[model samples]
Target: TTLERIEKNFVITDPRLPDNPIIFASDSFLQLTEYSREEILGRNARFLQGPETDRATVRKIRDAIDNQTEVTVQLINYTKSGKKFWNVFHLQPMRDYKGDVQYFIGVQLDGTERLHGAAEREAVMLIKKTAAQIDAAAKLAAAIQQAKEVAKEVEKVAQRAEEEGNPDLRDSAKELRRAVEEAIEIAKKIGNPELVERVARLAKKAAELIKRAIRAEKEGNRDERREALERVREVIERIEEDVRKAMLIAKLLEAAKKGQIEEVRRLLELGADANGADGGGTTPLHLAATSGQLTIVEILLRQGADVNAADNTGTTPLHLAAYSGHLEIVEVLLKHGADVDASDVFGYTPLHLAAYWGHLEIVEVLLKNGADVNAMDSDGMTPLHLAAKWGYLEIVEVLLKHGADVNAQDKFGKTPFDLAIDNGNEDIAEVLQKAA
Candidate 1:
């Protein structure tokens, strides 16, 4: 009776006895998932997956379980009544002291609330920051126009000064002086010498100011002329900074994200920016890449999307492709000159993300394109370390083949073998043991 006690936080699945069904589940497990013991038993855990469930995470779980290792992942799962929740769970093989697999134990927690809070935080921050950027960009554009007006005045002043300095200018000045003389004659005819003198003085002052403006233009490094060139370049920089300028650029961005082929073609023909940006300085290529819209990404590249356009988070489209496990996107992106080593927030490159998620094909493609196999993250953990942490046999083997250090330690002094053994990943432990 004492030996029959089982913790409420655990579940036991017997592969040897029932092949794929959960033979036993704790009372707490039943309450957490909202299913009765009869409803849970004799059914695989995959019954919890729904349309929103990520196939990549499911594949990782499958890989680890098949090799009698351990895995922990946070993925969307559905309850018996079809309510969706984020399940952060750990699954490991239960072995006797002699190391023979007996059963599989799963421990899970509902983490949707915490993850939703993080999403909300990111959303609010992005909105405020992006709005500020757009406002600043608009003010800079207005400043550019104001500068142009000042530049025009500079040119006029310089023109008058030029008219005074050269003979051609002298000809124009002669006409002006002649007109003023005519005005003076008229004033003299008005029978007032004082008025004539005053009119004559006005002409003298005009000639003096014009002379000064023209002579200033002749001095080395004519600042007024330079203002013209400088303002033009500055305005161009303003327009390029946001890519929210002219053309059918915004339309192209929308169509690319929507995966609308015909509309994208029509918009491109209407003349797109090719590298147009959206709110958050988002790139169309990232929208296409993240959604696994292969053709959208393909046409975008063929038309002229940048291979390494980063969104507001410093996340490149290559990172999006690798993060989503879209090998095709990364392959084409790399072929188009995307930087394989581009790192995002916290020094996570595409290789590390692919390794973290156990994306076999994406990892292979990135490695083949010369991604660093031993790339480190903010915690100083390499791709090999992440692969080992999850006990992904295929991912670790691929990393090892690509020259990853099996014994390299992270900041915490934990090596790949250390993680493998600690996680009860028997297969990974055996592989790393032999590598030693």
Candidate 2:
């Protein structure tokens, strides 16, 4: 009744009819090729090929057939109206019941635009941003020029970071520019004469590379554009290894943050510093630990990172893990010798942070590690005080049973009960007042 299950969406071909010309054609094949049944019936499928069709692919197909092997090739083809489409052509030997190869079956699909559209947006944006970074570097070099006024280049970076709306990057850029500006002024008194000239030359080269990249983009040549972009990347790596590491570590951080395990692994293998810290000393490990990236954290640790590194405010990776309620990361960090009672600038330990954030499990982990339930901050407020003041019923329950002082007061004379009273936490106040 039909090619039985072979519907109109499939191509059924017989190579023996015209000695490589298709003998029997599926109705769907005619529709896909935009040809009439009469025109397609006795013609070779190669009739669809145009000037853009790949000859190498066709030669491979011939080779496969001569050896009785299967082949899948993608080649450009022209439809009846002369429009181009990529044909994913698959040809294989289909043996009948007697175990003898009778007909060679061909299945062809058009896939040109699909692959092009998928990667275009990300590729273009990457090209644009890298070009902009190079352009920014050029401007900064000019600012450092003998007459280009070095500070302006740095200010431009600040504004650019501001435009990107990343507060951390903006903060780092501003602070660095401030420091550089002061150094440039001081050094001018007994200047390193070659420094200014070297920067100017590097700036000119960087600017030229940007022009080449942008021109390739205008010409719609992504391969050429990417080649030029990579040249800029290479240039940065050679003369400014600090910036190179910055880019790599930033990429590693972003990958870890997004839970991209493979990408994280790739970056680490590329020699990324797992402990690369921010302006505030927040390392990538801190964020990875906070984000509950157990695998990434494990990799970083195995790569010889410090288990107890702190941020600018003295907030350790353990503190962040505890605050974020990442139990597995906490366990891993502790196994790696993280301090159970590490304190921040606020004099709050990991236990204090976990309790203040109302994480019962984290409070349990700290207590299991012999953490002091009565640990005090600079203000003399204990974890019990933080727990009660924050109205954390479960943490208060855990701390009370673990020998925390119900009567512990802060520098301001606010005990756990007093804090509960101030916060209108009647449940906690009742619990503490009843204990008294």
Candidate 3:
């Protein structure tokens, strides 16, 4: 009773009518041609054709109608105002329940915009980020549906596993179903959206192989299940490949953190991100810096590690190198544009740390490289305050010569001179008093 099922701009014609006159023209088709229903209905679709309409395309459509088959062709047609428009015309026969052709449907699509736009020149199109995300989500959902269907198939094959009274086959069947179930959840929760369908494919193959094994066991075939097991193992190897790629950066980070040079080199050559950060936002450079792995630090820097990368606490590689008293590493970091004044969340600069740790050479190196001699920490205490409190006379003099704030007060209202005096370091106390 209706051709409403055809959603596009379409017109339905009864083949039983003489010359198959148009019986129903969709509102969309009428709007596209700028014609009213009375002008379109009860008339042949030929009214839309103009002098520019290709004779060959019309012949193809006529031949298709004569043979009662579907056809699609692109031709120029005219609107009611005689404006030429390119139409992708598709003609298909709709059959009734009795297998008799009941109606012929013509679907028209305007191709002028696409042919005249940028799409005509580019064979490939770039997908938008928002669209790509939506497509990936749909793919994940489809993979989940595929997994559910495979689970049903596996369950149907599961009966023979227990029926044969064989623990071997039962174990295989149970393991496969469990694997599929886990893959479904993994596909849903996986961080990389591209891996979803791939894992689903492997899971389905593994389940199908297990199903084959069970069927062979039911038929008393020994070698078939063995061959199927081999195939399943092959599929599992593919699954492991993806898992290994996901784990590579983490493994490289761990190796770099532990100062395992060989493993770090191996993973880097295998294409791990040299700058990949761990859960704590610690990169390979950060780990190697604190661990005093000079060569590892150099390798990471050469591999494009951010020379001044900061951790969650804003502690850069330079901060760690200075704190750990690695003079050569500190020099290397400074040469690579490491922020000498880079402070941590606690406002502890590399200079403050070197002075506090009594690394005189490091403190000197930082000073020569333009380290802030009077840089204050969160406690409002400068390098001079730390060096004086820790009784490092050389560091105290170094800070003083570099224009250190000798009388800077801490949060407790005590200056470097007061801290030196309280710590009973007359050498630092006198130096601070003179600098003040």
Candidate 4:
């Protein structure tokens, strides 16, 4: 009843059984082959073959069955009524948990029975159903991996479409974005943290590129459209290369922070650079400085580490070393050309960090090396404002000598004196008032 009720032309065979005869056939298959249920039930699919069948295709199918693999080919098959037609034949094996071949599924489509479009749609639907019977984890992994290949193909097609001046080539880029979007969803399905983030970023860039491409296409402008699509092509190229580098950068950053000297050296020897950074743009030198790994810092510096490399937040190695109170590292970096007054995203410089954290020696060292005492942050609060607010009395006195404006007002119009008074630091307030 199950077989008779279904409509697609397909058959299921059990490999564990002798001779591998058909255990079931769809009603559509019986009609397509012109065979009765009783007559086809115990017969191998060979019954559908006759004169003019390609032996190579037969051998290919035989090899697939013998190896428990999947194969799709076009061949000649004869119906019981002596009529011959092209069969778009697909055979796939079903494997259980133990990976033993459980069943073989054969989906037969007559190439001339309808328009080729309909045939393709039918084959795709049948293949989709067959794939559904497999393991989801493996399928998702395979899908993501294949998505990568598809991304490469998208690049090829987009380039050719652009080079040939084909305006409609933007379609492939949009399709690629969709494919990657689906892959991201599958990444979430499998809970792959790294894949989710990386693939999501790739999709976002692709979508932005498509919007730009579409805008350029609408303008009836030649060079602008070409440039826009060119950017789309290059972004895909850069994303691929960046992903390849990100893995090595992550390891190098880790080794730098954990003070794994040999690992750091080996990674560098293997082509990882001293300046290689992770997603946050925190390089090996930055990590080594922040983690107070002095020997590692020296090693990285010797390996051409940037003394003033900034992270995503604009915090440099000098800023980290100052805040971390690594007095020797601060001097070492300064000697190596670290910027004394380099500001972060929040505009807090190494001087501000040293002043706020009460690193008296570092504050003195920085001020001696051209640290700006009056450097204001995004909030317009200078090193003096931080030192006075936090009651660093010696730091306050030291900043005043370096020309810190005691009356400097922040964006909120709060001065260093006001902060000292508000925080009830009597000694700091006195020092600020005298400086004013």
Candidate 5:
């Protein structure tokens, strides 16, 4: 019966088999072999083995089983008629209640496709890791080179200062030394070893330059002093560039936070992009609206920024201002022709967001500007539906006054009033009840 089942491919293999070497195959295996249940009974399962099965692998499996241990092997096998296939075979000793080993049960699984997939995945991961290591090595080498350059400059400056004989020249060199030391200390504190070494080197060079100017000053060498001063100016300018980039970014961030229109304009005029996005894809316009910066919003709009620009979640500036109840910004954006009906990625128009958040004034302004009060989101919930659900009486009143459909049902077949009643908001439910 077991052989018959195996021949018919009724199961992958029989688990109850003893030493009789009975086997069972699944329907898929039977289909592959193209043999009937009666045709292959009592036949050696080895009939499936072919030249593709490695002799060493088969010997290893046989040795393990002979030692009364479980064994697993990969082999190529042939069907009843000679069609080749791969098989992963697991062999274990089975015992009955008599404490004597009775059967050696074997399970066969096809692993040809999975084995190839695993190999490909491993190869891709290896390539990625190698690339990452190369990049890291390159950055490390650059940092080391920068450190070496700084050290060399420091050494040259120290030697020049030691050779200077004039007292005034020595004093001026000391001041340059102090500035360099401070810069180097800052770099160290910031955990930038390369920058620390570089600053140290620049400080040494600056110190020597200062000493030269001091000697020229003592001897009335005006041209020498002038040249030294010019060199000093060039070094300061380089340092300032690095400092100003971070400072400018910080100022822009602070201005956005405070909703300061003048400060934002200053930063923008100084080369800040009006449409520049932050880490979250929120542009200055989005931040201004969210911060309730009515003046800033207007200034940005007039400066040609898109009043309807969206963030990472596709929420427009109008959506943010409306939801936050920034009536003035809402007005400014609307006046500037922000799309009142523009929906986000979630299909929520500014009106829907305003209504949902119970921003009564924003809802009113949107409705007055011809926003679709009955428009639905992807969930098919209209502005009125959200207002009613959240018990926003003022929003509901504004939408109703603008002729919103009271009988509008969402995709779930629930009307605004139904949701209001379901959430047990008697005020909103009553408002919708009368409107209906």
Candidate 6:
């Protein structure tokens, strides 16, 4: 009934009404315009058009409708009550069963809210763009400023050599120039605004190189010092590059640890892969999870990062989170599809780690997420066995409650109760005894 009513009185505002200006008006439209059916019928709805309607926009709408396609236009219209409002009009041509043109249908929507929403979105986007540009420019300026300082220092060293009138001093000055040049190139290559930390590392390396050269000159072994100074300069340059890479990793880790979701998002948007692994083979998700940064963990999971991605130690983010007693992080990770049964280099699942560390809350969270308490590590020790051996009576109780076998043994055939007795943990022994 609603569709039927919509079809009967819908006005065709499409300029492609090239055939005829047959317009329909809905009851709501009539009520809003304060116009009676008699006053509005059989007349072109152009009476509602105003100066706010762009001629080019009107032409495009007409062409689309003429081609039997759908089109949307936003324009200002005045009601019979002289109230001006914005309308987003969507027009489409309806076809009959024979594929013949039946009638044009138009749906009018109030666009005032949507128009403001679009403007706000544009403003936010502009602010983000401007902030990025300013950051880039500031980084560039810092590099230039650093280069100038290096140049000034180099000039001063050269002036001292000239005033001393010693061939050795002049040679040392030349070596210093080479070192400064290398430092400048390194700084240039670290072009990213976010790489300020890397740039600072490089600058420190450069200064160290210059200081080494100055020290060698002061020692009076001019020839050997000059050669040593060149070698040190090369080593410093190489170290600077390495530091840059390390700084990048550190920055990513810091972002994860601090739970800076926006910075993490910006890094991801700027092509920092969520799955980007560090030297330890751990991803950003791993760091975030291990630190118990629930917000960052959630953000990374929603961005499609692999929750089960393992580090060099064969530990997934879930494993790390469990080891660190991050129960909330573990819960959030498991909720977003982290595998509870995934193991690490030592063949320890998240449950194994939690239970081994006597993390009662994490143990419960992992078990609730369907972690297998019976799963054994490389040492053939299940979580119950480890917990008992470590005298973690509460953890042992938790594992047993979650269906762990108290009599389960490791490779040496030692059950949980056996391990607790051997560890001299009488309390854990009694607990395991009671469970048994």
Report each candidate's C-alpha RMSD, comma-separated, in the order given: 25.3, 27.1, 24.2, 28.3, 23.3, 25.6
Cα RMSD (Å) between model 6 and the true structure? 25.6
lDDT of 5 by residue, 1-436 (tens): 2133232122222334443343444455567567765655544455566778788888886687667665545578777777776665656554433655544545555445423211322332233332222222333344445544554554555456457644444444454444444444443222233444555556556656775776777688999988986786566455545334434544665688787778998997886667755433567788888888777887777777888787545678998888789899889899998999997655788888787678888888898898987888766788888887878888788888998999998877888889888888888888888877
Evaluate residue 262 in candidate 1 and report its C-alpha lDDT on the 0 to 100 scale. 85
| Candidate 1 structure quality by residue, lDDT tens digits, 15-46 | 88655678767676787778998898888888
* Alpha-carbon lDDT, every model: 0.66, 0.66, 0.73, 0.73, 0.64, 0.65
Off by over 4 Å in 5: 1-250
166-241 in candidate 3: lDDT tens per residue? 5665565566666666555544433233454566667677767877887787788889988987887677666666
In model 6, the Cα lDDT at residue 42 comes to 62
Candidate 3 regions exceeding 4 Å error are 1-242
Candidate 6 Cα errors over 4 Å, as ranges:
1-251
**10 residues in a row with least lDDT, candidate 6:** 1-10
- What is the number of residue pairs that collide in model 3? 0
**Highest TM-score among the candidates is held by which one?**
3
TM-scores of the models, in the order given: 0.47, 0.47, 0.49, 0.48, 0.45, 0.44
Expressed as tens digits, the lDDT of each residue in 1-436 for candidate 6 is 2222332224533234454554555676677667886776566666777766667877877688568775656677777767777766656555443776555655555435434222322332233332223233444456556655755675665566566554554555555455545544543343343233344444455445545556666687677666756665565456445544544545566688678888887766655556755434658898888877788887777777898897655678888888788888888888888999997645678887787678899998888888898998755788888788777878888888889987777877888888888889889889888878
lDDT of 2: 0.66
Give one digit per residue, the lDDT tens place, for model 4 in 409-429. Answer: 988789989988998998888
